[PDB]
Amino acid sequence: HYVDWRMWRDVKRRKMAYEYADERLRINSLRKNTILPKILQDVADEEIAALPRDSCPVRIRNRCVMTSRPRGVKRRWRLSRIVFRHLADHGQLSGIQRATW
Amino acid sequence: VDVPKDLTKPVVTISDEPDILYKRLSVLVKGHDKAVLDSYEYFAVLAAKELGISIKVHEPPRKIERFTLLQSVHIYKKHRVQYEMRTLYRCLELEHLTGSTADVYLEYIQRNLPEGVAMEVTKTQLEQLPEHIKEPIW
Amino acid sequence: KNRAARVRVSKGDKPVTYEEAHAPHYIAHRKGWLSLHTGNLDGEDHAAERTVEDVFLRKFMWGTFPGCLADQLVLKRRGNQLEICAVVLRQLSPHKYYFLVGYSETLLSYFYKCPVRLHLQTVPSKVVYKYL
Amino acid sequence: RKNIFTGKRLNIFDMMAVTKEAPETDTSPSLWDVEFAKQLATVNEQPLQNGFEELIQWTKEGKLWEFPINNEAGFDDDGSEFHE
Amino acid sequence: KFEEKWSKILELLRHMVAQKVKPNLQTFNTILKCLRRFHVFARSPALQVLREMKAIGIEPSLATYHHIIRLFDQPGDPLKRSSFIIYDIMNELMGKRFSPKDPDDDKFFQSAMSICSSLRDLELAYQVHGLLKTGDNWKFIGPDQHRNFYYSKFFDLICLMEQIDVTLKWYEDLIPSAYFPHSQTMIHLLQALDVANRLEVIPKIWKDSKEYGHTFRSDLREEILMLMA
Ligand SMILES: [Mg+2]
Numbered sequence: 001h002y003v004d005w006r007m008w009r010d011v012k013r014r015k016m017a018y019e020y021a022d023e024r025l026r027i028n029s030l031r032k033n034t035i036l037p038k039i040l041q042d043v044a045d046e047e048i049a050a051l052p053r054d055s056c057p058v059r060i061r062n063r064c065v066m067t068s069r070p071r072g073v074k075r076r077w078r079l080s081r082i083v084f085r086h087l088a089d090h091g092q093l094s095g096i097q098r099a100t101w
Numbered sequence: 102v103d104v105p106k107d108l109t110k111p112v113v114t115i116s117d118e119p120d121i122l123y124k125r126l127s128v129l130v131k132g133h134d135k136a137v138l139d140s141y142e143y144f145a146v147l148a149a150k151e152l153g154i155s156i157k158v159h160e161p162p163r164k165i166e167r168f169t170l171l172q173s174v175h176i177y178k179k180h181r182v183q184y185e186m187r188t189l190y191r192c193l194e195l196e197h198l199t200g201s202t203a204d205v206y207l208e209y210i211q212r213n214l215p216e217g218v219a220m221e222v223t224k225t226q227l228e229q230l231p232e233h234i235k236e237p238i239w
Numbered sequence: 240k241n242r243a244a245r246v247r248v249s250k251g252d253k254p255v256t257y258e259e260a261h262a263p264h265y266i267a268h269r270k271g272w273l274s275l276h277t278g279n280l281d282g283e284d285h286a287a288e289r290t291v292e293d294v295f296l297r298k299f300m301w302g303t304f305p306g307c308l309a310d311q312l313v314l315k316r317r318g319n320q321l322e323i324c325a326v327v328l329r330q331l332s333p334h335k336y337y338f339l340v341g342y343s344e345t346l347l348s349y350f351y352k353c354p355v356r357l358h359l360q361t362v363p364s365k366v367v368y369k370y371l
Numbered sequence: 372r373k374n375i376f377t378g379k380r381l382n383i384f385d386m387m388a389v390t391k392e393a394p395e396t397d398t399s400p401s402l403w404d405v406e407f408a409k410q411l412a413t414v415n416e417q418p419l420q421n422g423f424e425e426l427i428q429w430t431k432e433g434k435l436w437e438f439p440i441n442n443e444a445g446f447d448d449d450g451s452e453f454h455e
Numbered sequence: 456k457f458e459e460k461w462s463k464i465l466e467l468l469r470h471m472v473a474q475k476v477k478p479n480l481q482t483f484n485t486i487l488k489c490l491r492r493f494h495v496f497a498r499s500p501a502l503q504v505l506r507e508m509k510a511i512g513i514e515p516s517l518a519t520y521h522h523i524i525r526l527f528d529q530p531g532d533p534l535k536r537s538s539f540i541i542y543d544i545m546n547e548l549m550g551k552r553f554s555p556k557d558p559d560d561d562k563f564f565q566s567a568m569s570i571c572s573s574l575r576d577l578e579l580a581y582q583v584h585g586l587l588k589t590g591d592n593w594k595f596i597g598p599d600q601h602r603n604f605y606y607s608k609f610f611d612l613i614c615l616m617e618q619i620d621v622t623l624k625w626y627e628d629l630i631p632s633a634y635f636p637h638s639q640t641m642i643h644l645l646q647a648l649d650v651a652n653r654l655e656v657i658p659k660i661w662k663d664s665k666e667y668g669h670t671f672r673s674d675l676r677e678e679i680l681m682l683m684a
C-alpha cells in the first residue's frame with residue numbers, strides 16, 4: 001500500500017541491506033588493510049561482490065515518506081519541500097515559522 | 102462540612118546507606134516560546150525557596166536555525182521561501198543539594214514541564230578518593 | 240500571487256475561523272502551533288516520527304468524528320502522554336461521543352504505545368471570525 | 372448495660388497462639404485462589420476521583436514514565452560490567 | 456427449623472477441629488450469612504459466633520458486621536435491640552482503617568445507613584460517614600447503585616433532623632459531586648425549607664431540579680406550587 005513501485009523497491013533494498021550489514025562489514029575489514037596477504041584479500045573481493053546487488057547501501061535512496069519524491073527531501077523530517085511547506089504553512093509543525101530578518 | 106477526618110500520607114522510610122551529595126545541579130530548559138519559560142522559571146524558583154534550596158537563574162543566548170526552500174512546485178528557481186526554528190534557553194543553577202532533595206524537586210518540575218519544553222539536567226556529584234588511590238602498591 | 244494557506248476573498252457570504260483567516264506569515268505573530276513537542280528543538284531527535292503520528296491523528300479523528308469537528312485539532316505531548324484537544328459540535332448525541340472517546344483513546348494507546356487522552360469542547364455552531 | 376462481646380461463646384475451637392511456620396509456598400495458587408483474589412480487588416474498586424489518581428494508576432500499570440527521568444530505564448545490558 | 460440446623464452446623468465445626476483444620480474469616484461469615492433467614496431466633500447465636508471470632512484472634516471485617524446488622528434488623532416498630540447493637544459496633548469500628556478480606560465488605564455502609572434512617576438518629580450517621588472518610592475507607596462504599604442508596608438515606612435524614620443552615624451545606628457538597636438526587640430527595644428538602652420558614656430558596660430548588668432531570672416530575676411540580684401559594 002506504499003505510494004508507488006519506486007518506493008516499494010527502496011523498502012526491499014533497505015531490508016536486504018539490514019540483513020547483510022554484518023556479513024558485509026566483516027568482509028570489508030579484510031579488504032581495508034595492508035596487513036593481511038594479497039591472496040586472502042583477493043578472495044574477500046570476490047565474496048562481497050557475489051552478494052546480491054540490493055544488499056549494497058549505496059543503492060538506497062532517501063525518498064519522501066508521503067509522496068516518494070527522490071529529490072528535494074529534508075533529512076530531518078523525511079519529507080519533500082512541497083509536503084513540508086503544506087504542513088508548516090498550516091501551523092502543523094511544532095516550532096516551524098517563516099523567517100524574516 | 103464534608104472533610105476527611107483523617108488523612109493518609111505516603112510512607113518515606115529512612116535507609117541505612119548514606120545519601121548522595123550534589124555540588125551543583127544545572128537545569129537547562131529549551132523552548133520555542135519565551136513566556137512559557139518565564140512562567141516555568143517563576144514556578145521552579147518559588148518551589149526551590151519553599152524547599153530551602155539555593156538557586157540562580159540566567160538566560161543563555163538564543164539559537165535560530167534557518168533554511169530556504171523553493172516557492173513553486175516547478176521551476177521559478179529565483180523565488181523561494183525561508184523558514185526558521187527559534188530555540189530559547191533558560192538555565193537554573195542550583196547548589197548544595199542531596200540525592201533525596203534533588204530526587205523530589207526534579208520530579209516535581211519534570212512532571213510540570215509544559216508542552217514544547219525540553220530539559221537537560223547536569224548533575225555534579227561529590228565523591229571521595231577510592232581505597233586503591235590512598236597509597237601506592239609498588 | 241501567493242496561495243499557501245490563504246482563503247481567497249469572496250462576495251462576503253463565506254464564514255471563516257480565526258486560524259483559517261490568517262496566512263502563514265502570522266504563525267508566530269497572531270497564531271500559535273497546532274502541535275507542541277520537542278522534536279524540532281535544537282539538539283533534539285525524532286522529529287520525523289512525531290510528524291507521521293500527527294498526520295495520522297488528524298485523519299483518524301476526521302473520519303472517526305465525521306461532520307462533528309468544528310475546528311482543527313490541538314495535539315499536546317508531555318513526556319509519554321499524548322493529549323488530543325478537539326472542538327466538536329452538538330448535533331451528535333452524548334451517548335455516541337462517550338463511545339468514540341473510549342474507542343479512540345484505547346485504539347491509539349495500543350497503536351502508538353503511549354497513554355492517550357481526548358478532551359472535547361462542544362460548541363453550538365462553528366465559530367466565525369469574519370465573513371470574506 | 373452489657374457489651375455484646377462479653378458473654379457466653381462457643382467453646383468448640385481452642386484458641387490458637389501462632390499459625391503454621393512454613394506453608395506450601397512453592398505450590399502455585401489454584402484457580403479457586405486466583406479467582407477469589409479478583410473478588411477482593413473489586414470491593415475497593417472505584418472510578419478515578421481526580422487527575423492525580425489517573426497518573427498513579429498508569430504508573431503502576433507501567434504506561435506512564437517513572438520520574439525523575441532515567442534515560443536507561445528498563446535497559447540493563449545483560450548485567451555486563453565494563454571489563455566485558 | 457433453626458433448632459435442628461444449629462445442631463447440624465455444630466457437627467461440621469466439631470469435625471473441623473477433629474481433622475486439625477483451622478477456620479478462617481470466611482468460615483465464620485458463611486454462618487452469619489446463612490443465619491439471616493431466621494431473623495428472630497439467630498439473634499443471640501450470632502453474637503456467640505462473633506465472640507468466637509475474637510477468641511481465635513480473627514479480626515471481624517466489614518462483611519462480618521454486615522451480616523449481623525441485617526440479621527438483627529427486622530421490620531419492627533420498636534427496634535429496641537437493633538439500636539443497642541449498632542451503637543456498640545461503631546465504637547469498635549471507630550478510628551480504623553480497613554483492608555479487603557471478604558467480597559461482601561463493600562455492602563456494610565449501605566446497610567448501616569439504612570439502620571440509622573430507620574432509627575432516625577443523626578449523631579450515629581455522622582459516625583458511620585465519619586468512618587467512611589478516614590484513610591481510604593471511601594473505596595468500600597460500593598458500586599453506583601449502592602452509592603446512590605447510601606447518600607439518599609443519609610441526606611434524607613439530614614434535612615429532617617438538623618438545622619437548615621447546615622442542611623444546605625451538605626446539599627452543596629454532596630450534590631452533584633457525589634450523587635445525583637432522586638425526585639424524593641428534592642421533596643424532603645422542600646419540606647425542610649417550609650419547617651424553617653426559608654421559602655425564599657424555592658426559586659433555586661426548582662432550577663437545580665431541572666438540571667438533575669426532574670423537569671417533568673408530576674409529584675414534584677405539585678408540591679412546589681402549593682408551598683409558594
Ligand atoms: Mg545516493
Ligand SMILES: [Mg+2]
Pocket residue numbers: 180
Ligand atoms: Mg512572490
